[PDB]
Amino acid sequence: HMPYKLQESFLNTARKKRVKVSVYLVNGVRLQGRIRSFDLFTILLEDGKQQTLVYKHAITTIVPHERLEIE
Amino acid sequence: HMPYKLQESFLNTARKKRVKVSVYLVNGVRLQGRIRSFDLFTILLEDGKQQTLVYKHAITTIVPHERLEIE
Amino acid sequence: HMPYKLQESFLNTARKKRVKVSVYLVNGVRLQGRIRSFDLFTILLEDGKQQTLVYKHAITTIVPHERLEIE
Amino acid sequence: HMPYKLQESFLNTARKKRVKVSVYLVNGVRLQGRIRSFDLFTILLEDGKQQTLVYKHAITTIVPHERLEIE
Amino acid sequence: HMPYKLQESFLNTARKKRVKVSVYLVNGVRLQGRIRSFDLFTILLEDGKQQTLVYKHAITTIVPHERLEIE
Amino acid sequence: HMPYKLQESFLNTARKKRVKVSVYLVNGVRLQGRIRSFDLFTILLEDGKQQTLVYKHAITTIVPHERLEIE
């Protein structure tokens, strides 16, 4: 009866499967790309050549463009 | 006289009973779906086929569409 | 010279005395109801039949509709 | 060379001296009253008969209506 | 290879050198004054006679009006 | 299988390589400069002569103007 690590499993599955995601921000901006890397407080998006470091505290939702079978 | 774990009991009861919820965000967006999973900082909503990872820091309120008898 | 637990005493007194409250949110929404339950990060409002889980991080102020003699 | 407890000394001095304050919120609302009580995360304002529990995370600034000689 | 205490050194240098600063808030308000005191979560601004306690969580940026040679 | 320190490696690589960055804030403001220094909660931007202390809690995204080969 231990809590599964939902956030880490979601982010790592999207990362490993190179699934494109939409990342929505508190101010209404929507980013798109792949999750190249993440850690406790940030996510590194990559879209083609561009890198964007996203602070999780600024994210409202992440919507994957393919269904994740969360590992 | 110990504090009951309100948040976890609310989320887990909604999850186990597959109760549809409305999740309101700080920016006025309202999401709807079932709570498939949650952890300390996030909630995984599911509406039919779509998955949405929601950061709790972006939520104002959660309103269940059926009364929860909180376990 | 120890700090009194103001937040917990306020919330628990409103809860035990079933005092109606107004809960104001960061986005200008005002909720009304009784505090049925609370924990470290959330408050369960009840208004007649409706339940609402409120995240404290989204609250600006709580105004009780009767004066609380804080226990 | 230890850090002085600025927040606690400011709040406690305003409280003990019953100095009226203006409390500004992140959404532009300005509250006025005396600090009757405070703890780690909240401040209890009182204006005549009305009580208001204010969450510190919603405050931008506190401006005292008399100069505080911070104790 | 230890991390330098940037925030504390910046704030303490501005304080000790009595450098006027601009403090910008999340809601677009700009405050001006000297940093008289600070602690983990707050900054005490002073402009002539007026005191203002500023919560760091409400600050976006601090811009010093003279270049700081950070100690 | 340990988590790489993404945020620190991103910030330190931008700092050491003196790469110009765009820092976007929760309120829509965009800052530009080099990361001269950072710590757990703040980033010191420098643009020519001007210094700006940025609180990370106010940042949504950081976009480097050159691709970082994150060290």
Numbering used by the authors:
A (entry chain A), B (entry chain A), C (entry chain A), D (entry chain A), E (entry chain A), F (entry chain A): 3 to 73
From the manuscript:
The host factor Hfq, as the bacterial branch of the Sm family, is an RNA-binding protein involved in the post-transcriptional regulation of mRNA expression and turnover. Hfq facilitates pairing between small regulatory RNAs (sRNAs) and their corresponding mRNA targets by binding both RNAs and bringing them into close proximity. Hfq homologs self-assemble into homo-hexameric rings with at least two distinct surfaces that bind RNA. An Hfq homolog has been identified in the phylogenetically deep-branching thermophile Aquifex aeolicus (Aae), but little is known about the structure and function of Hfq from basal bacterial lineages such as the Aquificae.
Upon co-crystallization with U6 RNA, a second, distinct Aae Hfq crystal form was discovered. These crystals could be indexed in space group P6, with unit-cell parameters a = b = 66.19, c = 34.21 Å. The Aae Hfq·U6 structure reveals a lateral RNA-binding pocket that accommodates two uridine nucleotides. Two side chains in the N-terminal α-helix of Aae Hfq, Asn11 and Arg14, contact the phosphodiester groups, and another cationic residue (Lys15) is 3.6 Å from the phosphodiester group linking the two uridines. Backbone and side-chain atoms from strand β2 hydrogen-bond to the bases, ensuring uridine specificity.
